[PDB]
Design a binder for this molecule. Sequence first.
Ligand SMILES: Cc1cc2nc3c(=O)[nH]c(=O)nc-3n(C[C@H](O)[C@H](O)[C@H](O)COP(=O)(O)OP(=O)(O)OC[C@H]3O[C@@H](n4cnc5c(N)ncnc54)[C@H](O)[C@@H]3O)c2cc1C
Ligand SMILES: Cc1cc2nc3c(=O)[nH]c(=O)nc-3n(C[C@H](O)[C@H](O)[C@H](O)COP(=O)(O)OP(=O)(O)OC[C@H]3O[C@@H](n4cnc5c(N)ncnc54)[C@H](O)[C@@H]3O)c2cc1C
Ligand SMILES: Cc1cc2nc3c(=O)[nH]c(=O)nc-3n(C[C@H](O)[C@H](O)[C@H](O)COP(=O)(O)OP(=O)(O)OC[C@H]3O[C@@H](n4cnc5c(N)ncnc54)[C@H](O)[C@@H]3O)c2cc1C
Ligand SMILES: Cc1cc2nc3c(=O)[nH]c(=O)nc-3n(C[C@H](O)[C@H](O)[C@H](O)COP(=O)(O)OP(=O)(O)OC[C@H]3O[C@@H](n4cnc5c(N)ncnc54)[C@H](O)[C@@H]3O)c2cc1C
Ligand SMILES: O=c1ccn([C@H]2C[C@H](O)[C@@H](COP(=O)(O)O)O2)c(=O)[nH]1
Ligand SMILES: O=c1ccn([C@H]2C[C@H](O)[C@@H](COP(=O)(O)O)O2)c(=O)[nH]1
Ligand SMILES: O=c1ccn([C@H]2C[C@H](O)[C@@H](COP(=O)(O)O)O2)c(=O)[nH]1
Ligand SMILES: O=c1ccn([C@H]2C[C@H](O)[C@@H](COP(=O)(O)O)O2)c(=O)[nH]1
Lengths: 210, 214, 216, 211
Amino acid sequence: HHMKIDILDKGFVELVDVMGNDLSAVRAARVSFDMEERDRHLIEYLMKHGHETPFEHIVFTFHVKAPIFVARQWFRHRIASYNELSLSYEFYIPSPERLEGYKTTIPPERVTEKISEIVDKAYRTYLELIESGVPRRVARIVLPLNLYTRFFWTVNARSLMNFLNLRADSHAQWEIQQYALAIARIFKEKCPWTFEAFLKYAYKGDILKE
Amino acid sequence: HMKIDILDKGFVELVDVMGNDLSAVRAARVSFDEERDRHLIEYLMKHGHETPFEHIVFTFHVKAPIFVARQWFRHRIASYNELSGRYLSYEFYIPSPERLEGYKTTIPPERVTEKISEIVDKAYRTYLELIESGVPRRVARIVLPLNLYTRFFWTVNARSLMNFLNLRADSHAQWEIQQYALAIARIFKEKCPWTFEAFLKYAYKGDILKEVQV
Amino acid sequence: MKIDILDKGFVELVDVMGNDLSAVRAARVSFDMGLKDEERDRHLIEYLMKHGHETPFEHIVFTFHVKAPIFVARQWFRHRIASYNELSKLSYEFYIPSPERLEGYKTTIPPERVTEKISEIVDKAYRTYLELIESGVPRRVARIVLPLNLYTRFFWTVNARSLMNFLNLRADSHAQWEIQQYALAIARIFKEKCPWTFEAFLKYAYKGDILKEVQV
Amino acid sequence: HMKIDILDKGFVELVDVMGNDLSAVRAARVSFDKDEERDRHLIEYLMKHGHETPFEHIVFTFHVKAPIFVARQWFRHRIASYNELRYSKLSYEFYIPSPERLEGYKTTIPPERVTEKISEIVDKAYRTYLELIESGVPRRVARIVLPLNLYTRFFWTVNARSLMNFLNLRADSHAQWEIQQYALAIARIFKEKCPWTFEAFLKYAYKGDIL
Ligand SMILES: Cc1cc2nc3c(=O)[nH]c(=O)nc-3n(C[C@H](O)[C@H](O)[C@H](O)COP(=O)(O)OP(=O)(O)OC[C@H]3O[C@@H](n4cnc5c(N)ncnc54)[C@H](O)[C@@H]3O)c2cc1C
Ligand SMILES: Cc1cc2nc3c(=O)[nH]c(=O)nc-3n(C[C@H](O)[C@H](O)[C@H](O)COP(=O)(O)OP(=O)(O)OC[C@H]3O[C@@H](n4cnc5c(N)ncnc54)[C@H](O)[C@@H]3O)c2cc1C
Ligand SMILES: Cc1cc2nc3c(=O)[nH]c(=O)nc-3n(C[C@H](O)[C@H](O)[C@H](O)COP(=O)(O)OP(=O)(O)OC[C@H]3O[C@@H](n4cnc5c(N)ncnc54)[C@H](O)[C@@H]3O)c2cc1C
Ligand SMILES: Cc1cc2nc3c(=O)[nH]c(=O)nc-3n(C[C@H](O)[C@H](O)[C@H](O)COP(=O)(O)OP(=O)(O)OC[C@H]3O[C@@H](n4cnc5c(N)ncnc54)[C@H](O)[C@@H]3O)c2cc1C
Ligand SMILES: O=c1ccn([C@H]2C[C@H](O)[C@@H](COP(=O)(O)O)O2)c(=O)[nH]1
Ligand SMILES: O=c1ccn([C@H]2C[C@H](O)[C@@H](COP(=O)(O)O)O2)c(=O)[nH]1
Ligand SMILES: O=c1ccn([C@H]2C[C@H](O)[C@@H](COP(=O)(O)O)O2)c(=O)[nH]1
Ligand SMILES: O=c1ccn([C@H]2C[C@H](O)[C@@H](COP(=O)(O)O)O2)c(=O)[nH]1
């Protein structure tokens, strides 16, 4: 198992590992070792009726590189395991296209440039404070929320479906939607029957059926 | 699949596993030399950094008496699917005579064993007569004894499994679940030998796994 | 508040943290009570429930004391997002289904005789238990002969969001009748303590059948 | 009611509490229906043997105002409930370390100058934030330039067992100093409301140094 999807300017979602497949839910539901029409029908049956515990026996590990404002939202998802890096310094700079629909009173390129400029100033201050003898944990508090971080995320398919309901949705901020779309893409590749049944029966958001 | 027999008719069988010792190293490093990797495992265990071990996950298939399952299912940080009937066999745990020896008893331990057998057969007979009379299964089943075997799948990460071993692979736990915990330990050790050894050395709070190999 | 359930069971409220307004204060992140406005606060509860913002309800918490048969407790304890403490001084009482429990089904003996047969095997299993305990068998070994209808007791501490999940699944005709009866009591106490949350739960979020038909 | 100021603008305040020491005792005994010495002895017994489940039946709600870098560490504690500040209005304040914060480390510029440089960035970053917002950039996008020392507020509902785990990890000299200060206040409130449980915790179970 290995997939990697680039997100934003420097981000990514990378698949590290997966335990199981669609049939792992079928086996869990039946408490059996079965290894097709009947099995798809059971997955659909479980999804329609909200019998989601069998999907907890499918597990993914992802490696995610995302800005802190994104990771902070993501880490609100309690039913999962996280290890975050505690070092490189890179920042998410929104592209000009990101800023359209909004009739900004300055050109979107200049908004991009203003963001780049303040990020550069904060980063230079951070580096000065460090070279001055300030400990990193203190100096780092000037750094902006668009600083990239990386983490490992281990999550089961049920909790992943919850994650997608909330984040693969127009009510979510655009940046996390882009991460959710990549998470969805990998889920679909690894668990096509579960994913399709999720979309058909259980998915509460808008963007995945668009 | 590794399958270890426990009690008279029980077992623990490994269904699947995600990762191995290196899964905790990669998670600690957040990064996708064998002695350096082993050193990190010991370091994490020694200094109480337990979260990397959540990235190693097991699924077991367990057949156990209900009184054992009831204790086991108290472990909340795990996923369970138990046999019900709408997606059964009827066997019962009968303790061996050796199970009961030591406790000063008034009758012989083999008679205690037969007295348990006798009451199990009477209760199962009543269950069958109720069923064949039209009583629905999940009402008739309430007369069956707590030593009735059940089966379940259990998906559990290594951190939670280690908590489970602390509590159940220990002489304060009832002897029956101790036996199941010993089997869970054997499998954990086989798949994650570096984690297991570090766990014994630095974090394990129980008594039995320091003395009983595997 | 204590409500009798089945022949010897009960649900008893031990404690409660908060009320409907606890969810409102958590949603707003404000412990400012000098601007209370009932209409506004009740509208927020509805809005949260309507749009699936469930986390504010986690700041209302209950503790119950429940006496139920083991086969009921086994189902109930599958609800992981909660805290349990079960009895391990002990009493020995068993749930014997009433004749009316066992009609609706076409039994080939009278429902009366089913009750008698269940009572009789319970008595026999209990006598055997006692015989083994007098003989020197440790109590935790002798008890394995006791039937699944043996009563147990537990404390259950659970937040309102998890409680609503419990009601979705257990206050429902797909649940076994015995745990339905317990869920109806749990619902009654929830409604008494958090009436606005309960009402909005039924209107917008509740997935089961029974609570929409059966008052309280 | 109980409020403790933390850092330059932060706080921990107690919103509510369910139960007290006797809630763990009732839970352990499974008994709703006095003997002080016996009840203290049970609490000590549970703590020293690691029978921690009874302490799950004591629950707290706190209202906390903390910089984001502190809140990021705190929210890693999963066995709890959080609501962070659309429903309520937003203010913009930032944690500026005091010069004494930098005492011990031998810096190449005076500590007051470090304070000053941190204030400079806050001002410039916040001024850029406002420029971007006045220009039609959405707040959720403009705010990405703001530093990690921006204050946020949240409600935290947590049981006493989970609170003890939090204190083990955060009331400790290995935790960053700022979250230590918050943990100290959490511990104080816990001590006030559950003195027997807290005392037993220090005696037998607490793994940190600072408490
Ligand atoms: C020897 C022995 C005797 C026992 N006697 C009794 C008895 O008399 N009565 C009885 O009811 N039970 C009894 N138990 C069961 C025991 O109280 C626990 O329910 C069981 O051991 C599971 O432990 P756990 O909570 O650590 O595991 P899990 O429930 O898997 O939790 C793992 C860890 O996650 C954390 N956690 C998970 N959920 C919560 C939460 N809601 N709040 C705070 N932290 C949480 C804790 O840190 C916990 O250690 C006994 C267990 C043992 C081993
Ligand atoms: C009518 C009916 C028939 C049933 N038949 C069976 C059966 O045949 N076999 C059987 O084993 N069980 C059966 N159950 C039990 C069922 O599978 C659940 O264990 C039980 O209802 C608890 O529900 P829950 O997981 O939503 O609740 P909780 O365990 O309290 O969890 C609450 C919520 O937290 C989330 N959650 C908690 N832990 C995890 C986790 N580890 N991973 C992902 N998400 C998590 C989920 O969103 C869940 O809704 C049955 C239940 C009902 C109501
Ligand atoms: C000094 C210090 C340095 C740190 N450095 C880093 C770092 O570099 N990177 C980093 O990512 N984090 C770091 N952390 C965060 C740390 O790894 C934990 O996320 C945090 O301390 C919360 O601990 P917890 O999991 O015990 O608490 P909770 O998340 O509240 O869990 C409570 C208890 O429940 C159990 N539990 C809950 N969920 C699960 C689960 N899914 N699986 C198994 N068991 C579970 C565990 O027994 C746990 O003890 C650091 C913390 C400290 C104190
Ligand atoms: C569009 C949008 C706007 C948001 N705005 C805000 C905001 O303003 N403030 C804010 O704080 N957060 C906000 N959030 C975050 C939101 O409150 C949740 O924290 C986040 O969506 C995680 O959802 P969850 O609890 O279902 O996931 P998890 O935390 O993984 O929980 C998974 C499931 O387990 C169950 N569960 C887990 N733990 C508990 C528990 N302790 N009690 C009861 N059930 C539990 C629930 O059934 C839950 O669905 C927002 C999210 C979205 C998508
Ligand atoms: O869309 C949202 C809005 C808020 N939050 C949570 C994450 C933070 O804990 C807090 C504030 O997030 P921001 O609105 O600052 O992104 O609420 C989300 O998870 N998603
Ligand atoms: O060693 C024990 C003793 C008790 N319990 C829990 C399981 C049940 O929820 C309840 C009663 O268990 P018995 O003592 O009746 O097995 O307490 C355990 O998990 N382990
Ligand atoms: O309605 C049900 C059916 C099953 N189970 C869970 C409880 C047990 O863990 C297992 C089997 O329960 P019974 O069907 O045998 O009650 O599945 C429930 O929780 N509720
Ligand atoms: O003392 C620490 C160090 C790290 N982390 C977690 C929180 C973040 O998710 C991530 C990085 O935190 P910082 O070291 O960057 O604060 O690791 C903590 O909780 N406490």
